[PDB]
Amino acid sequence: GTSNRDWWPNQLDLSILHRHSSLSDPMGKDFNYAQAFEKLDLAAVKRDLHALMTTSQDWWPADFGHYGGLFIRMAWHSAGTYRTADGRGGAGEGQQRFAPLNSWPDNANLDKARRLLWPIKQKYGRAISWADLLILTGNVALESMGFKTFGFAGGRADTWEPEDVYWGSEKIWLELSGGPNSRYSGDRQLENPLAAVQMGLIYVNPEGPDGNPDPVAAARDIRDTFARMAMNDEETVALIAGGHTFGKTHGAGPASNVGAEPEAAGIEAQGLGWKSAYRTGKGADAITSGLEVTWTTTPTQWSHNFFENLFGYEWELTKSPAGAHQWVAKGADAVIPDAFDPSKKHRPTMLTTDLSLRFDPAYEKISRRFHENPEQFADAFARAWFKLTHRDMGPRARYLGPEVPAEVLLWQDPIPAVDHPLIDAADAAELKAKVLASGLTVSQLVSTAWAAASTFRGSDKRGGANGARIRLAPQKDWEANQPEQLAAVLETLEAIRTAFNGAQRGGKQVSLADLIVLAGCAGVEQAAKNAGHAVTVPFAPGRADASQEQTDVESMAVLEPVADGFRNYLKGKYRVPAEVLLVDKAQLLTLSAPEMTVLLGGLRVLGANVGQSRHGVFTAREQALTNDFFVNLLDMGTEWKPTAADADVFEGRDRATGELKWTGTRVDLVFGSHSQLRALAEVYGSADAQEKFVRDFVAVWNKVMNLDRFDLA
């Protein structure tokens, strides 16, 4: 069945922007998961989960009679695909039940876990999402086994198809580094945006880097991948040691016994995979990773035994029954229970990556401190578990239910509570008037509010104009944001704000976050007036200003646009074509193809480009809101050619005279090239489309201004 991707493997793909359509979703368009969850009896759900922990099913018998370990692993996997580079992955969409993640090798036998949860899912229906239920089950596993969690928030709505995520270019599961599609180069540098060391792993290889069992070099991978999932050294030790306080690994026999992963299994397997020909294929004979390690003397109860063993023994390299590298305690007694036979006992064992916690110098200091102060280990693990499983939930305003922690955490990019009356319609008209009277230009106003709001990404719901972080480090210094021009606009808006607030009664005031956005609104209204159209742009007050102390500068760095097609900005040279980067950014901002088209064509004529570039400014009335970009781009009287100096810059010249009309980038011209985008441009470039263009522009502007406004949701 030959397809367009077969004939034209390099053409830009837009299907990423029209995922998650009302067509694939079985719930009605009016369904509101937050409202459903809010009515769920969460206490009842958690009782059913407690009971489940020790209700062993014969098709996948519980180790030590308790599923807790397996379910902690399931939840750590649901959350462990997260990358800070784009915010993609993580537990917030329940993607573990779809391709490819349901069939990654590191998710082997988590299909069993998920199926054990079907009876609970089915009982509570739509009032609890799979996404939420995977995390809750992990919380309950912890609690059942004696560990007090820091809290839980509901709110993760299910999704109904796979997201398109770049997980790497390897065409072989688990391919070691240095192949034709290597994710590494240089001195072990992992390519952005990836956060795992091999295709189909969560973070690192439990045997060591590319299979080499060197705990010290494994530490290097752990530190790098975990940092790419937003965890520092303390959170990393806490999570790994916390986790491997419970349960066991499975490697009872050779991996050759294990058959097809779920997406490749026969129809009769009914959604499950990795069927094993080894003995019973399950339970005592289970094969999952190929390792056979049980870390503690009480695998079903919280203890301080992980660090006791790690430091209390010396370790010797050995092989599991499947032939994988692992470690065993020199000269120890057989103190570790067997998962199924009360008459067997085993010596303590560890993974290469567990030993990293001791043989990496920096990890050893932390591990020793946890060993000596197990109350500090327990509290760090509670906190890092909450972070791990909530990191892609977005602002606290999205957190649902009775178990949400009250403590405000730096990682949540907290926004202060609004404690005062908000500006009303009259006040917003008075402020827009003062903004326009100050001398600020349409280009300034629009570029500034674009820079504040366009940081949002819906993958992890970080970013946006709430907070007024544009005035803080590091956003105020980003090159894309034009730090000197920014500084002048913000000075002028800050004087307007001060004077407005100074004149109020009753403690009414306006935040600088709201003013930035309202000012961008004024500039759009002025641009419409410039073109002879009376337009009013919507505006919703209620944003608040975050402090510098509420704004982790290092964590903010991943939000820096290094490509923003909407401002014709490319920070340097990338292997990925600029148009590909545009569609990616559109995806992050949650825009469809039509919204991306309208919004770029308007921004162009409004003077939102970085550095005042003329690239793509296809109008002779800059700062007037018109459909000029589309009419001129599509004019076959103009002929386009890449420049001698730079193949990624084009000159449009009159076809008869030869005279230079315009210049453009690939971002600009792709709208006149790609057959779907050009179809869209043609709608906006038609003679009956001036009003439609303005209206669709103002709608997508307002959508972008409100992307992080979950306080209004």
Next chain:
Amino acid sequence: GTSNRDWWPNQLDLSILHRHSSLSDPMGKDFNYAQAFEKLDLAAVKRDLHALMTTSQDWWPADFGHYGGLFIRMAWHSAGTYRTADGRGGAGEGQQRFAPLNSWPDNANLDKARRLLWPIKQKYGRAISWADLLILTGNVALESMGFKTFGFAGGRADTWEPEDVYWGSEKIWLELSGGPNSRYSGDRQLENPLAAVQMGLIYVNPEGPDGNPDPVAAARDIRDTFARMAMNDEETVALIAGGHTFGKTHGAGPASNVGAEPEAAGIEAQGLGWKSAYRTGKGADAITSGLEVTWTTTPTQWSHNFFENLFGYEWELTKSPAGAHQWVAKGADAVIPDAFDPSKKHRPTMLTTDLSLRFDPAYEKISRRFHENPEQFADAFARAWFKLTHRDMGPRARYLGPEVPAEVLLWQDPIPAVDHPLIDAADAAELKAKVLASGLTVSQLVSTAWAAASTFRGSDKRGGANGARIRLAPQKDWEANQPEQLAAVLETLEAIRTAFNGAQRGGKQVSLADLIVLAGCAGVEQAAKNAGHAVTVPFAPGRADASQEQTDVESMAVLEPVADGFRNYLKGKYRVPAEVLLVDKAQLLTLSAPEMTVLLGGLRVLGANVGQSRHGVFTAREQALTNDFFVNLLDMGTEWKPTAADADVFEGRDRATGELKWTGTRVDLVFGSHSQLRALAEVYGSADAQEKFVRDFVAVWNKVMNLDRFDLA
């Protein structure tokens, strides 16, 4: 970027069902093209098109100063992708402007043609679709050159992305037959559903079969492909001779001078392709097919010169300047004009496929009669041209504007006008009650109305319950429709109809078409009552009954379901897995994945299966409308295995006892296997889903019942 299709190349693909989403469409959700077109000043458009025919642009100079021939070709290609086997292709969605068609080799330089229409598209905007404008332009070309067309209908709404159509398996453009992906086997049998002899051709190879210039054997390909586009011998001769009365072919120099097709061209090409390094690249130097043939002495005017030349000379084989095989009349004077140089003249030339019209014995009789009676040729061509360009438009109710022909054609599957008052709500309630009192069962009622309505296909908008053709040849004898049970139901409904109509005042009466649907509604209402729920299924009267004499039996054959997963029916054994055939049928019925899932799971428990098979009937309350299919399918207490007797049939047995519970096909079990479909089945299989299942089932039942009701559009 490695994707799910790379890892699992054989998994079922659902993305075909969620094409044409509101996300990709730039028009408002309320936009109604029929309304827009109805206010178009069509006469003004056609005046601008007229002018265009002789206004040459320097970037694509008009041959003989007249674009007409190019535009006829453009419109023939727009319409010529149509296959009767599935109704896919055709001009009705303007798909020529999207991949792959915009870049097929047979569409070379039609990108020029489309671009020459942009100024007119732009001028009239949304009130004329590209789809419409391609056909209209070809009409106006014909008219400008003295040919009287049969009519024109507007109403082809634009689409905004490529359809997914199976165009064959070859991975090489224009690959000759007999390769590793050959579309032929046996004695020259072309695989269904294909209707072209090589990948990226419209119908046949102009040089002869696989390039062998034998007119007689070329005739065999023409007749086979044209039949697969719904054209008989008479319509084929007329269309080929008709078309080649105008214009010329382009082969001024070697093919190697021609560059990348549009989808592969650089961004600077701005959507155009086949840039040529041969001399000026255009005009007198144009290279399109590589042939260099001009058929008539007046390439810009209708005439009967095609057959005068074809019969008036003897032909000899020669090569064009690009090396392609074609024919020349050596004994002729140089009577044919040159397209650019008034001082040059050329001998008559023909394609091998033109000579087929003379050397195939059956074609020669028709061609001779056209030759001797060119008024009959003009009429046959006007009629076949209208058919060619309207064949996928659907019911005459969809035809818009002032030029629609009044003559009703057999090929349109015509529906008689309704001349009497319709039944109202009370009447429909009285008829539902009579149907249910007759003894007809929920299974009979639902099966019959499903069989009538489910012939519809949105690809060409043929089929559906309007017309009551289920009672006529050939539908009444299709195996899927269970001819003997059908006959009994229709007898009983016909007695109900007679008695109702006999009792009326004022000429009110009910069609058998309407009654079949209303009866299916009553069966669904009773099934819901059987399950303890009172519902009203919506119902819209207005269908009419067509006669046998208004029903082309041979053309109806392509609508026979040979696979209908919604009735667990497979007429014989196919290479394509049954689940794939299900999704394809869903696509034809215009269903999303959720609607396909609800619909199938209800139909199973209602007793819709062919032959009363138990396969997938996972309920102990058959004929009650419940969500039992999903609850039982998803019960992990049941284990499934393929049977010894048939690998495509499965037994579900109790996992603990081994007792046989159910049997099912691939069609049934895919909903418990495929990760997206199983997520759907889960929503409908949850404990809070009885109401949702019934409501969503009734909504999709109704959707199906109304698929051909463009009279209510």
